[PDB]
Design a binder for these strands. Sequence first.
RNA 1: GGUGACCUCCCGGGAGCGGGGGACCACCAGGUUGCCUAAGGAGGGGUGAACCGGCCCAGGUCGGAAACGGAGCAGGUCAAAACUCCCGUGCUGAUCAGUAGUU
Length: 105
Amino acid sequence: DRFICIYPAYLNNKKTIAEGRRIPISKAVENPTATEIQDVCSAVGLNVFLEKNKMYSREWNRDVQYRGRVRVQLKQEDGSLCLVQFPSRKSVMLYAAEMIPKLKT
RNA sequence: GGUGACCUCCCGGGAGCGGGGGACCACCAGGUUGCCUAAGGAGGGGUGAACCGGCCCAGGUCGGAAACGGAGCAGGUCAAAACUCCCGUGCUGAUCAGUAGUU
């Protein structure tokens, strides 16, 4: 239950910083989905679980392609980093951003 | 000096979110002014909706165990998106009396 949250808004290049986004547009992507996010995180060997029915507070678009939240574990609950490659939320996001595009395209 | 946006960094957080460094843009107030006008007030208003302003936001809604918060509707509201009318100012058609002043 002590896992960092991650909304797809954080990575969406068609959203302003005030609309949620957490990473520079240059590194961001178009319309990332919680599904896409979970898949690229898990596939690197991260412990991730997907909450299909959480919405972003700042998200306004009531249709399914923008719903969803991805929870990720960084820590084994002895305080140590599950992985050394992923110390921070930002380190997660930037990676997901880097990996999502190799899927569909 | 102010407002609103937008971009890019840190920092704290399980969320909504919290702390802080830069960059840029728009507008505002009112303090000096000009290689400035034919004349250019630092006026007065109104719209600000079907989503585009900003603010306050019932409900609802998203996040939350909750506190509370986000986004924001109906309604209210504006020194400060944008739009627009009026006043002033400048040129510029025109009207009336057959009015004069003087023939």
